[PDB]
Design a protein around this ligand. Structure first.
Ligand SMILES: CC(=O)O[C@@H]1[C@@H](O)[C@H](O[C@H]2[C@H](OC(=O)[C@H]3CC[C@@H]4[C@H](C3)O[C@@]3(C[C@H](OC(=O)/C=C/c5ccccc5)[C@H](C)CO3)[C@]43CO3)O[C@H](C)[C@@H](O)[C@@H]2OC(C)=O)O[C@H](C)[C@H]1O
Ligand SMILES: C=C1[C@@H](O)[C@]2(O)OC[C@]34[C@H]2[C@@]2(C)[C@H](O)C(=O)C[C@@H](C)[C@@H]2C[C@H]3OC(=O)C[C@@H]14
Ligand SMILES: [Mg+2]
Ligand SMILES: [Mg+2]
Ligand SMILES: [Mg+2]
Ligand SMILES: [Mg+2]
Ligand SMILES: [Mg+2]
Ligand SMILES: [Mg+2]
Ligand SMILES: [Mg+2]
Ligand SMILES: [Mg+2]
Ligand SMILES: [Mg+2]
Ligand SMILES: [Mg+2]
Ligand SMILES: [Mg+2]
Ligand SMILES: [Mg+2]
Ligand SMILES: [Mg+2]
Ligand SMILES: [Mg+2]
Ligand SMILES: [Mg+2]
Ligand SMILES: [Mg+2]
Ligand SMILES: [Mg+2]
Ligand SMILES: [Mg+2]
Ligand SMILES: [Mg+2]
Ligand SMILES: [Mg+2]
Ligand SMILES: [Mg+2]
Ligand SMILES: [Mg+2]
Ligand SMILES: [Mg+2]
Ligand SMILES: [Mg+2]
Ligand SMILES: [Mg+2]
Ligand SMILES: [Mg+2]
Ligand SMILES: [Mg+2]
Ligand SMILES: [Mg+2]
Ligand SMILES: [Mg+2]
Ligand SMILES: [Mg+2]
Ligand SMILES: [Mg+2]
Ligand SMILES: [Mg+2]
Ligand SMILES: [Mg+2]
Ligand SMILES: [Mg+2]
Ligand SMILES: [Mg+2]
Ligand SMILES: [Mg+2]
Ligand SMILES: [Mg+2]
Ligand SMILES: [Mg+2]
Ligand SMILES: [Mg+2]
Ligand SMILES: [Mg+2]
Ligand SMILES: [Mg+2]
Ligand SMILES: [Mg+2]
Ligand SMILES: [Mg+2]
Ligand SMILES: [Mg+2]
Ligand SMILES: [Mg+2]
Ligand SMILES: [Mg+2]
Ligand SMILES: [Mg+2]
Ligand SMILES: [Mg+2]
Ligand SMILES: [Mg+2]
Ligand SMILES: [Mg+2]
Ligand SMILES: [Mg+2]
Ligand SMILES: [Mg+2]
Ligand SMILES: [Mg+2]
Ligand SMILES: [Mg+2]
Ligand SMILES: [Mg+2]
Ligand SMILES: [Mg+2]
Ligand SMILES: [Mg+2]
Ligand SMILES: [Mg+2]
Ligand SMILES: [Mg+2]
Ligand SMILES: [Mg+2]
Ligand SMILES: [Mg+2]
Ligand SMILES: [Mg+2]
Ligand SMILES: [Mg+2]
Ligand SMILES: [Mg+2]
Ligand SMILES: [Mg+2]
Ligand SMILES: [Mg+2]
Ligand SMILES: [Mg+2]
Ligand SMILES: [Mg+2]
Ligand SMILES: [Mg+2]
Ligand SMILES: [Mg+2]
Ligand SMILES: [Mg+2]
Ligand SMILES: [Mg+2]
Ligand SMILES: [Mg+2]
Ligand SMILES: [Mg+2]
Ligand SMILES: [Mg+2]
Ligand SMILES: [Mg+2]
Ligand SMILES: [Mg+2]
Ligand SMILES: [Mg+2]
Ligand SMILES: [Mg+2]
Ligand SMILES: [Mg+2]
Ligand SMILES: [Mg+2]
Ligand SMILES: [Mg+2]
Ligand SMILES: [Mg+2]
Ligand SMILES: [Mg+2]
Ligand SMILES: [Mg+2]
Ligand SMILES: [Mg+2]
Ligand SMILES: [Mg+2]
Ligand SMILES: [Mg+2]
Ligand SMILES: [Mg+2]
Ligand SMILES: [Mg+2]
Ligand SMILES: [Mg+2]
Ligand SMILES: [Mg+2]
Ligand SMILES: [Mg+2]
Ligand SMILES: [Mg+2]
Ligand SMILES: [Mg+2]
Ligand SMILES: [Mg+2]
Ligand SMILES: [Mg+2]
Ligand SMILES: [Mg+2]
Ligand SMILES: [Mg+2]
Ligand SMILES: [Mg+2]
Ligand SMILES: [Mg+2]
Ligand SMILES: [Mg+2]
Ligand SMILES: [Mg+2]
Ligand SMILES: [Mg+2]
Ligand SMILES: [Mg+2]
Ligand SMILES: [Mg+2]
Ligand SMILES: [Mg+2]
Ligand SMILES: [Mg+2]
Ligand SMILES: [Mg+2]
Ligand SMILES: [Mg+2]
Ligand SMILES: [Mg+2]
Ligand SMILES: [Mg+2]
Ligand SMILES: [Mg+2]
Ligand SMILES: [Mg+2]
Ligand SMILES: [Mg+2]
Ligand SMILES: [Mg+2]
Ligand SMILES: [Mg+2]
Ligand SMILES: [Mg+2]
Ligand SMILES: [Mg+2]
Ligand SMILES: [Mg+2]
Ligand SMILES: [Mg+2]
Ligand SMILES: [Mg+2]
Ligand SMILES: [Mg+2]
Ligand SMILES: [Mg+2]
Ligand SMILES: [Mg+2]
Ligand SMILES: [Mg+2]
Ligand SMILES: [Mg+2]
Ligand SMILES: [Mg+2]
Ligand SMILES: [Mg+2]
Ligand SMILES: [Mg+2]
Ligand SMILES: [Mg+2]
Ligand SMILES: [Mg+2]
Ligand SMILES: [Mg+2]
Ligand SMILES: [Mg+2]
Ligand SMILES: [Mg+2]
Ligand SMILES: [Zn+2]
Lengths: 103, 159, 62, 144, 100, 185
RNA sequence: GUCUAACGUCUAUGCGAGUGUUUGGGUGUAAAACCCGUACGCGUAAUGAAAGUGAACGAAGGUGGGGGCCCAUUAGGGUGCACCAUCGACCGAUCCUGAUGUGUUCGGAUGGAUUUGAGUAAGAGCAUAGCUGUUGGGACCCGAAAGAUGGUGAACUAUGCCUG
RNA sequence: GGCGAAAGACUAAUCGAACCAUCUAGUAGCUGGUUCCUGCCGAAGUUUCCCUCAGGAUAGCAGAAGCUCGUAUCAGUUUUAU
RNA sequence: UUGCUUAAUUGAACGUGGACAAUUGAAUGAAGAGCUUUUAGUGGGCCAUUUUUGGUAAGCAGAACUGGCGAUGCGGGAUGA
RNA sequence: CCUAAGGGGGACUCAUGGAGAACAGAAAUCUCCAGUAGAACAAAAGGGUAAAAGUCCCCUUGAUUUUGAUUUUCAGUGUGAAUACAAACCAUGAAAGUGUGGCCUAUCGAUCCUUUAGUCCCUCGGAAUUUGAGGCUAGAGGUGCCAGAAAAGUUACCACAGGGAUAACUGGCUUGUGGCAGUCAAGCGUUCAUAGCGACAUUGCUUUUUGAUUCUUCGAUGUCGGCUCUUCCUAUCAUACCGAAGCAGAAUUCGGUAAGCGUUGGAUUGUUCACCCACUAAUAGGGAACGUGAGCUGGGUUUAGACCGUCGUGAGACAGGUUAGUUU
RNA sequence: GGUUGCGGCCAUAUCUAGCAGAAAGCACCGUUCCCCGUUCGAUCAACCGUAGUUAAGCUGCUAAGAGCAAUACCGAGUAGUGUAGUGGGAGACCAUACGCGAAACUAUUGUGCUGCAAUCU
C-alpha cells in the first residue's frame, strides 16, 4: 500500500468548510497516562492479595492492523483521522508505479 | 463449507438473454414511472448499481418513491405467518411497467362504453365477466364428411 | 452425539393456523423513505391548499 | 381439502349442486379423486329436495317443510315454492347460486346394495370416483 | 433466569437475611405501653407541663426554606433578650441551645 | 366425522354480563337488557354492551371532554351519556349548562355541573326522559392514555416504554440505546 | 410448587388530579373496632452526559374511515366519542443561521434541517384484594464426588524411647 | 499432620488425606417422584443467538381474558389478464 | 396549492367542483371480519408415498413437499406406533 | 492486495488465424485482411463488459463531510456488506453527466479499559484561576471458539451424577469383504469346449470371516480358551445302494439318494487358529446368546505389587515383553 | 417514393458472391496559412466546392445461398409431468385412469418496418 504525503479533502474546520491541502501522517497512539481513572482503578485493584484481578488477552488472531491517516490542514491546523483497510505492507509517499518498464 | 452470498444461485437468473447482451435499448431510460404504478422487476446483470436482491427478480409491486435514476417499489414478502412490507430502491434498468394494468383499465372503459350505449338505447347490458360455459346443441353436416372408420394398429418395430 | 440438522416439516402447518394473512391496505401510505426534496415541498403545498379551502368555506359561511 | 371445504363437502356422503362452467369445473377436477358426481335427472332433484332438503336460515339447518320458509328466504329471487326451487336447480337458472347456497349440503346415507368392490378409483376403471353422469341417478337412488 | 418483557428487579436477599427479620407484632403493645409511660410522666410532674417550650427555626436546604419547624432550644441571645439566664431557664421549662 | 372449517365449541369472546357482583349495576343491566331486546333503537344495544365493560374499558371522562363534545355544531343541548365515572378538571376556565347522565360523579364534577346550571343524573333517570336515547351523545374516555399501554409492543425501533423500575442515566441508556455504545434500537 | 420481599398482565372495589387512616397521635368494651394529621411515596413534565431549557398557528390541527346521535324521504345530508391509517403543530437533545446589544466575548432575536427522546397535543392515577407469570430466598420433594471451621483419637497399628 | 527396612502401606473392621460436630436443607443443565372428578380447547421437537451440542433465551405452535365492529372484506381453492 | 420541477402558463403530489347507481364491473365458500394483552408446554423425534444425496447396501445416514404416528382409540392387514 | 488496480474524460481494440518483409529459424519486429470476444478485467468461481468495464494517454482524490431511509442474513436484533436519495464540499469533462473506494457476488469485530481527533463545549457539587481529572461525538488498539472466558498435564490409586441420547459381547438389518454355487463357452485336456476343467463377463446363495450401523441392555445378561454333555444342519471325510470316466484289473476321480452311523491318541502353544508325530474306514465343516463359569478350571485378557525396553522434564503411557494376583 | 440529419423497435435489418443505381443528397476527392493532432495532414484539425469520380461507400435487385423470422392434418398428442389404485412385475421398471403437455425433425412462407425535420427530375 502506497499513500501520498499530501491530499485535498474536505476540511471540517469552521474556518475552511471546503477541500484544502492536507499533510498525511501515520497516526501514533499516545502514551498511556498514569492518572486515567481506569488506569487508576486497575492499579488499586491489583494491589494487596488476590493475584491478577483483571483479564490478560492471549488468543491473538489478527495478523495486521488498521492503518489510520492523520490529516492536518495546512490552513487551520485541524487534524482529521481516516482508517484504511487491513494492509500488511504500507509506505507513505513511496515511489509511484511506472507502467511499461521492462523486467 | 456453506456459501450464502447476496447473488448466490443467480447464475442463470441474472444472465442476459441469448443474443441480447450489451447495451440497453433506450426505451428503458425513456419510460416514466409515477408513484402508484405497477411494475415488473427483472434484474439486468449488466447494471450492478441499484440492482435488486435475487428475491425480487420476477416480482411485481407498487412505485412509492421516484429519485434521480431509481424508483422505490413496495413488495409484500411472506415472513413466517404474515406479510412484511419491503421497500426496495431500484434503478429503472431493472424495472418495467406491469401489463396487468392495461387489460383491466381497458375493461373499465369498455364497460363504461357499453353501459352508456345500452343507456342510450334505453335497454340493459350485463358487464360481469363469465367463465366459459358448456356449449349448446348443434347439427353436423355430412356432405363431404361421411364418417371414416378407424381401428387401432398392430405393433411394429421400425428400427 | 449427532442430532437432526434441519427440517422444514410441519412449518407450513403452523403458519396456516392463524396466519398467511394479507396486509391491510389504507388510503394513505406512510411517506417514510420518500424523497426529502419532494417531501419538504409537499409540506408547503398541503398547508397552502388547506388555507385556500379554509378561506373558500369561510366565504360560504358568513 | 380446501376445495372440498369450499364445496361445503365436509363429511362423507355429502351432496351439493354445482353449475358447470370453467372455474367450478377446475374445482371439481381438483376434488375428483374423492367425489362421485354426475348429471342429475329431474326426478332425482325432486326426490333429493323433498326428502333431504334443508335450508340455511340464520346459519341453521332447517327442514323445508313449508313453502313459507322458501318464500321468506328466496322471494327476492322469485322462488315461492319447492317446485320453483326444483325448477331453478334443474334448468340452471339466473339465481342458481343463491338457491344452491341456501340449500344445506345433502346428508345422504350409504348405498343400499353397497359400492363397487373398491371405491377409490375412477368410475372408468371399475371404481367410484369421477364422472358417472346418468349413472349418478342410480347412485343417488342407492343413497337417498 | 431472565425471561419475558419484565422489569429488572433488585431483590437483595443473598445473605443470611432470615436470621435478621424484625416483625413488629408488638406495634399495638408498644403503643399501649408508650401511652402508659406517658401517663406516668404526666402524673409524676403535674401540673408542670410534660413538654418544654421549643423555639421556631427555619428548615435548612433549598427544598425546605419555605417551611419552619420546632427547634431544640432558645439561643443565648434570645434568652438574654427576655432576661432569663440559661441555667435558670432550664429549670422553668425552657429549652436552651448554646449551638444555634 | 367432520372436516371442521372453523374451531368447534368456541365462546363468543364478548362479555354477556358484568364481571362485577354489584347488585345495583345488575339492576341497570336488568333495565337495558329489556330495552335492547325490545326497542330496535341502536342506542340501547350499545348501552347494554357498555355496562359489561371492565374498568380499563370504561376510562374516566373528564369534564373537559364533555365540554368539547357539547361544542360540536348543533350539540349544545344534547344529553351527555358517560357509562363510567365523570371526573373534574381544574384546568377548565368555564363550564356550560348541561344535562349529564353517568354511573358516578366526583365531588368536583357534581359541584361543577350544578354550579353552572346543569344536571347530574344517573343512567336510570336517563331511561325515562330518553328511553330510546333520543338527542343524546355518548362520550368515551381515552383508552390509549393508560400507563400500561406505554410498554405494549416493545421492541427494537418500536419507540415504546421499557418496563423499568428506576429512571436515570445509569438505567438502560448505554448499549443498544446509543451509537457511541455499539448500536441503537 | 409453599411463605416472603419486590414486580408484569388481567379483573373487582374505593376515591379521583389526586390518592394512601395504622410510622406515629387520639380513643377503646384493649393486639380488634372507631377517630386524627404534618410530612412522605407514587401520580400530576419532559429532555439532555451536563451546564440547562421546558409543552396552543388553528375551535388543542388537517385528510379517509368510525359506533352512536340529529335532519331526512330508497337513497342522501349533518354531527361524529373510543379507535385505526396518514400528513402536520408544540417541548427537550443535535446541527445550521446569527438582530438590537455588549465586562468584546458574551448574549441568542429570527428563520430552518432525509436527525433524535421512555414527551405535549382538555390529565388518570393512587390504594386494597384475587388468580396466573418473574426474580432472590432451603424455594416442588429427596440426592453427590467435593470445600471450610472447630474439636476427638497411637486400647488396633507404624516407629523411637523406658522398664520387664 | 504423624509414622513408614516404601505397599500409597499403617494411623481403633475407616486411609491416594482418620474420626466427630458445625457451616449445611452446600450446589447439581443429571436420575427418581410429584396425591380428587368432570367439561372445553389443545401443541412442539422448527428459526436466530449462546464454551451452545442432555441446557437456556428468543420466535413459532397452544390456552385464557377479552376489545372494536356486523357482511364490512376475508380465503392453504378455481377462472381471466399479466 | 407549492419554497419542488420545466424554457414555460410545463409537470409532480395533494386537492375544490361535476358526471358515471346497484350486473358497482369473474367463480366458489365464509359458525363474520379485524384488533390487543398475557402466559404454559416444547425446542432428542420418527414413519409412508413421491422427489432426492452419501454409501455395495442397511430395520443406515441426510434433505424437499404433503399426510400420519408421536398425542389415537375403532373395523381390516393372524400378529405389528 | 491496490495512490491506482479508486474517479472522470478521450483515443484505440483483445485471444487467435491467413498472406507477406535482411540477418529472423516453431518463438524477436514490421504490414494488410479476417477476427461476437474464442482475451483481459489483483485473487476462487459464477455473472457482467467491445467507438468498453478491456489497452494506452491526460487530469485528479468522491478511498471526503453531516447524518437519516432501505436490502441481505433476520428475532425482521446485532455485525458485515451493499442500494437510492437529502444537505455540503470537490474532481473530471465542451457538456449532459458520472464519482460517497475497488464491475457485481467474500475480504471481518460488542461491553469494560486505553489512545487520537472533534466540539474548545459541560462538570470537579462553599466561590474562583491555572494544571490535572471526568463527560459528549467519531476512529484505533480485539476478541479467527470470529454475538466476543483470562487458562498445561497424568491417574493401571481413584470418586460422583448420569447415559444404552454413545464404544468394548450376543442378537437384529445389510453382505462390501469372506465362503460357497451357477449360466455363456474363447481355451486346457495326445484328437476332442463341457470324462475332468474352464478365461473375459454375468446371475446367485450363505452368515462359521471382517466390515458397516448403533435398534436392545450401562439402578450389570459375568466379555478368551479348554474340560464335560446333549441336540441340530449339510455345503458328505468314512460307511450303504447306484450313475459317469481320458473306469482292462487294482487304484482313483465326478455325480445321485443320503446326516442312519462314526469322525481318534499325542509333542509345542493360554490359545481359537496353526504345525509336526501316529493309529484309523475316516481322522469333514458348522450351529445351539461366537451352546456350555450359581458346571468346573482360571493358563490368557483387563484393577491394585514389581522388573525391563521404547516414549515423557515429570507425574506417568504402551492396543510391547515379564512375574504375583479372592471365580460367591 | 429516393436521399440526408436525428431516431424507435434492435438480424424479416446480419454474412458471402455477383449486377444495377436517373435527380438531389451523401460520399470519395483537391490543399496545408491558420486552430489542432500525428513517426506519418493515414486518423484527428483546418481551407477550397475550386480540378475530378460513381470505382468504392451507400442504396436496390439477383442466390433450390448460410443465418434470421413466421406459420403448421410435420413429427406428436410422442418425451416428460400433476393426480390415483390392496394395478402388473422378484426386480429394473411398465401399463391403465382424470388432466397438462415439449424439443429436435420435416415442409412452407418472408428477408426490415417505422417516427420527427429538411431536401429532390
Ligand atoms: C504485557 C501484556 O502483553 O499483557 C497485557 C496486559 O499488560 C494488559 O494489562 C493492561 C490493563 O488491562 C485491562 O485493564 C483490560 C481493560 C480492557 C480489556 C483489555 C485490558 O482491553 C480490552 C481488550 C482488547 O485489547 C487489549 O487487549 C488491550 C490491551 C492494553 C494494553 C495496555 C494498555 C491498555 C490496554 C480490546 C481491543 C480493548 O479492550 C478489554 C476487554 O478486554 O489495563 C491497564 C490500563 C494497563 O496498564 C495494563 O497494561 C500494562 C502496562 O500492564 O492487558 C492486555 C490484555 C494484556 O495483553
Ligand atoms: C456383567 C456384565 C453385563 O453388564 C453385560 O451386559 O453382560 C456381560 C458384560 C456386559 C456387556 C454384554 C454389555 O451389555 C454390552 O452391551 C457390551 C459388552 C461388550 C459387555 C460385555 C461384558 O462387559 C462388562 O464389562 C460387564 C458384563
Ligand atoms: Mg479538517
Ligand atoms: Mg475516558
Ligand atoms: Mg504489594
Ligand atoms: Mg484483597
Ligand atoms: Mg486484590
Ligand atoms: Mg471443500
Ligand atoms: Mg455450497
Ligand atoms: Mg433468464
Ligand atoms: Mg460499486
Ligand atoms: Mg438493492
Ligand atoms: Mg346494466
Ligand atoms: Mg451432543
Ligand atoms: Mg435438535
Ligand atoms: Mg354449492
Ligand atoms: Mg341387504
Ligand atoms: Mg356389491
Ligand atoms: Mg352396486
Ligand atoms: Mg368393497
Ligand atoms: Mg373385497
Ligand atoms: Mg335408503
Ligand atoms: Mg361426532
Ligand atoms: Mg402518558
Ligand atoms: Mg395525551
Ligand atoms: Mg401529596
Ligand atoms: Mg389498628
Ligand atoms: Mg393490649
Ligand atoms: Mg433535570
Ligand atoms: Mg447531548
Ligand atoms: Mg450592534
Ligand atoms: Mg456589533
Ligand atoms: Mg454583533
Ligand atoms: Mg438579548
Ligand atoms: Mg416524538
Ligand atoms: Mg396526556
Ligand atoms: Mg430441597
Ligand atoms: Mg420458587
Ligand atoms: Mg418465589
Ligand atoms: Mg444434601
Ligand atoms: Mg474448592
Ligand atoms: Mg500402643
Ligand atoms: Mg500406624
Ligand atoms: Mg522391649
Ligand atoms: Mg493441621
Ligand atoms: Mg507439626
Ligand atoms: Mg502406586
Ligand atoms: Mg475410631
Ligand atoms: Mg468402622
Ligand atoms: Mg484399619
Ligand atoms: Mg447438559
Ligand atoms: Mg378438540
Ligand atoms: Mg433424558
Ligand atoms: Mg423457551
Ligand atoms: Mg416456524
Ligand atoms: Mg372483512
Ligand atoms: Mg394469461
Ligand atoms: Mg369530486
Ligand atoms: Mg372470469
Ligand atoms: Mg403473543
Ligand atoms: Mg408463551
Ligand atoms: Mg407464546
Ligand atoms: Mg415460550
Ligand atoms: Mg418456557
Ligand atoms: Mg433421537
Ligand atoms: Mg430435550
Ligand atoms: Mg404408490
Ligand atoms: Mg400414488
Ligand atoms: Mg432417516
Ligand atoms: Mg439415528
Ligand atoms: Mg400417509
Ligand atoms: Mg414424547
Ligand atoms: Mg389414527
Ligand atoms: Mg383390529
Ligand atoms: Mg388391527
Ligand atoms: Mg400379514
Ligand atoms: Mg477498474
Ligand atoms: Mg481511472
Ligand atoms: Mg477510467
Ligand atoms: Mg473511454
Ligand atoms: Mg476506506
Ligand atoms: Mg451472524
Ligand atoms: Mg436488521
Ligand atoms: Mg431484522
Ligand atoms: Mg443493520
Ligand atoms: Mg443488517
Ligand atoms: Mg453526487
Ligand atoms: Mg468551581
Ligand atoms: Mg471500538
Ligand atoms: Mg474496536
Ligand atoms: Mg463461541
Ligand atoms: Mg480456555
Ligand atoms: Mg501402573
Ligand atoms: Mg492406563
Ligand atoms: Mg442405543
Ligand atoms: Mg456377498
Ligand atoms: Mg463376494
Ligand atoms: Mg454380521
Ligand atoms: Mg450393539
Ligand atoms: Mg450394560
Ligand atoms: Mg435390574
Ligand atoms: Mg444368566
Ligand atoms: Mg472372558
Ligand atoms: Mg448333499
Ligand atoms: Mg441322529
Ligand atoms: Mg491331551
Ligand atoms: Mg497339548
Ligand atoms: Mg500371546
Ligand atoms: Mg493366533
Ligand atoms: Mg450372553
Ligand atoms: Mg449364538
Ligand atoms: Mg457369528
Ligand atoms: Mg460364549
Ligand atoms: Mg450357565
Ligand atoms: Mg461362577
Ligand atoms: Mg467361560
Ligand atoms: Mg449348585
Ligand atoms: Mg483369569
Ligand atoms: Mg491368572
Ligand atoms: Mg498389575
Ligand atoms: Mg526418560
Ligand atoms: Mg510394540
Ligand atoms: Mg504391559
Ligand atoms: Mg521371553
Ligand atoms: Mg504369590
Ligand atoms: Mg453371597
Ligand atoms: Mg410503397
Ligand atoms: Mg450525383
Ligand atoms: Mg488529408
Ligand atoms: Mg479533420
Ligand atoms: Mg457508388
Ligand atoms: Mg457503382
Ligand atoms: Mg432462404
Ligand atoms: Mg436460407
Ligand atoms: Mg405418469
Ligand atoms: Mg387386493
Ligand atoms: Mg394422460
Ligand atoms: Zn482547515
Amino acid at each position: 500500500v502506497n499513500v501520498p504525503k499530501t491530499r485535498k479533502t474536505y476540511c471540517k474546520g469552521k474556518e475552511c468548510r471546503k477541500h484544502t491541502q492536507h499533510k498525511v501522517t501515520q497516526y501514533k497512539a499516545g502514551k498511556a497516562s498514569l492518572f486515567a481513572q481506569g488506569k487508576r482503578r486497575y492499579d488499586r485493584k491489583q494491589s494487596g492479595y488476590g493475584g491478577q484481578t483483571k483479564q490478560i488477552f492471549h488468543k491473538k488472531a489478527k495478523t495486521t492492523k488498521k492503518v489510520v491517516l492523520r490529516l492536518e490542514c495546512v490552513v487551520c491546523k485541524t487534524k482529521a483521522q481516516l482508517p484504511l483497510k487491513r494492509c500488511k505492507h504500507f509506505e507513505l509517499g513511496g515511489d509511484k508505479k511506472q507502467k511499461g518498464q521492462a523486467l | 463449507g456453506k456459501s450464502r452470498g447476496y447473488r448466490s444461485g443467480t447464475r442463470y437468473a441474472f444472465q442476459r438473454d441469448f443474443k441480447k447482451h450489451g447495451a440497453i435499448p433506450l426505451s428503458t431510460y425513456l419510460k416514466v414511472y409515477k408513484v402508484g404504478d405497477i411494475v415488473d422487476i427483472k434484474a439486468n446483470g449488466s447494471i450492478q448499481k441499484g440492482m435488486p436482491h435475487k428475491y425480487y427478480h420476477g416480482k411485481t409491486g407498487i412505485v412509492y418513491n421516484v429519485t434521480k435514476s431509481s424508483v422505490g417499489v413496495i413488495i409484500n414478502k411472506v415472513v413466517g405467518n404474515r406479510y412484511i412490507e419491503k421497500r426496495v430502491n431500484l434503478r429503472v434498468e431493472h424495472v418495467k411497467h406491469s401489463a396487468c394494468r392495461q387489460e383491466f383499465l381497458n375493461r373499465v372503459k369498455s364497460n363504461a362504453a357499453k353501459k352508456r350505449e345500452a343507456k342510450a338505447n334505453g335497454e340493459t347490458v350485463y358487464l360481469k365477466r363469465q367463465a366459459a360455459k358448456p356449449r349448446g346443441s348443434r347439427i353436423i353436416s355430412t356432405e363431404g364428411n361421411i364418417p371414416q372408420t378407424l381401428a387401432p394398429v398392430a405393433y411394429e418395430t421400425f428400427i | 452425539a449427532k442430532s437432526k440438522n434441519h427440517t422444514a416439516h410441519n412449518q407450513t402447518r403452523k403458519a396456516h393456523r392463524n396466519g398467511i394473512k394479507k396486509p391491510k391496505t389504507y388510503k394513505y401510505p406512510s411517506l417514510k423513505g420518500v424523497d426529502a426534496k419532494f417531501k419538504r415541498n409537499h409540506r408547503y403545498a398541503l398547508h397552502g391548499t388547506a388555507k385556500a379551502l379554509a378561506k373558500a368555506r369561510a366565504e360560504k359561511s358568513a | 381439502r380446501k376445495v372440498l371445504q369450499l364445496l361445503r363437502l365436509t363429511q362423507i356422503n355429502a351432496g351439493v349442486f354445482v353449475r358447470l362452467t370453467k372455474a367450478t369445473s377446475e374445482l371439481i377436477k381438483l376434488a375428483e379423486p374423492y367425489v362421485a358426481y354426475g348429471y342429475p335427472s329431474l326426478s332425482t332433484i325432486r326426490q333429493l329436495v323433498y326428502k333431504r332438503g334443508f335450508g340455511k336460515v340464520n346459519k341453521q339447518r332447517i327442514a323445508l317443510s313449508d313453502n313459507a320458509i322458501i318464500e321468506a328466504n328466496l322471494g327476492k329471487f322469485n322462488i315461492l315454492s319447492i317446485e320453483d326451487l326444483i325448477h331453478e336447480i334443474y334448468t340452471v337458472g339466473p339465481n342458481f347460486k343463491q338457491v344452491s347456497n341456501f340449500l344445506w349440503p345433502f346428508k345422504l346415507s350409504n348405498p343400499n346394495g353397497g359400492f363397487r368392490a373398491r371405491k377409490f378409483q375412477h368410475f372408468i376403471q371399475g371404481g367410484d370416483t369421477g364422472n358417472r353422469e346418468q349413472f349418478i341417478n342410480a347412485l343417488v337412488k342407492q343413497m337417498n | 433466569a431472565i425471561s419475558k418483557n419484565l422489569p429488572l428487579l433488585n431483590n437483595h436477599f443473598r445473605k443470611h437475611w432470615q436470621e435478621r427479620v424484625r416483625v413488629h407484632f408488638d406495634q399495638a403493645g408498644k403503643k399501649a405501653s408508650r401511652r402508659q409511660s406517658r401517663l406516668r410522666k404526666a402524673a409524676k410532674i403535674a401540673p408542670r407541663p410534660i413538654d418544654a417550650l421549643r423555639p421556631v427555626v427555619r428548615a435548612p436546604t433549598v427544598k425546605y426554606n419555605r417551611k419552619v419547624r420546632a427547634g431544640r432550644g432558645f439561643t443565648l441571645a434570645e434568652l438574654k433578650a427576655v432576661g432569663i439566664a440559661p441555667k435558670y431557664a432550664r429549670t422553668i421549662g425552657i429549652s436552651v441551645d448554646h449551638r444555634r | 366425522g367432520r372436516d371442521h372449517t372453523s374451531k368447534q365449541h368456541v365462546r363468543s369472546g364478548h362479555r354477556t354480563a358484568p364481571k362485577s357482583d354489584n347488585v345495583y349495576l345488575q339492576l341497570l343491566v336488568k333495565l337495558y337488557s329489556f330495552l335492547a331486546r325490545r326497542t330496535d333503537a341502536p342506542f340501547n344495544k350499545v348501552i347494554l354492551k357498555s355496562l359489561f365493560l371492565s374498568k380499563i374499558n370504561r376510562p374516566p371522562v373528564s369534564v373537559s371532554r364533555i365540554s368539547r363534545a357539547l361544542k360540536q355544531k348543533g350539540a349544545a343541548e344534547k344529553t351527555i351519556v358517560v357509562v363510567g365515572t365523570v371526573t373534574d378538571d381544574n384546568r377548565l376556565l368555564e363550564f356550560p349548562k348541561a344535562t349529564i347522565a353517568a354511573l358516578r360523579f366526583t365531588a368536583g364534577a357534581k359541584d361543577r355541573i350544578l354550579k353552572n346550571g346543569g344536571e347530574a343524573i344517573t343512567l336510570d333517570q336517563l331511561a325515562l326522559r330518553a328511553p330510546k336515547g333520543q338527542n343524546t351523545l355518548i362520550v368515551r374516555g381515552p383508552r390509549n392514555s393508560r400507563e400500561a399501554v406505554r410498554h405494549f409492543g416493545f421492541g427494537p425501533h418500536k419507540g415504546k416504554a421499557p418496563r423499568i423500575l428506576s429512571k436515570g442515566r445509569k438505567f438502560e441508556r448505554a448499549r443498544g440505546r446509543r451509537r457511541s455504545r455499539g448500536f441503537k434500537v
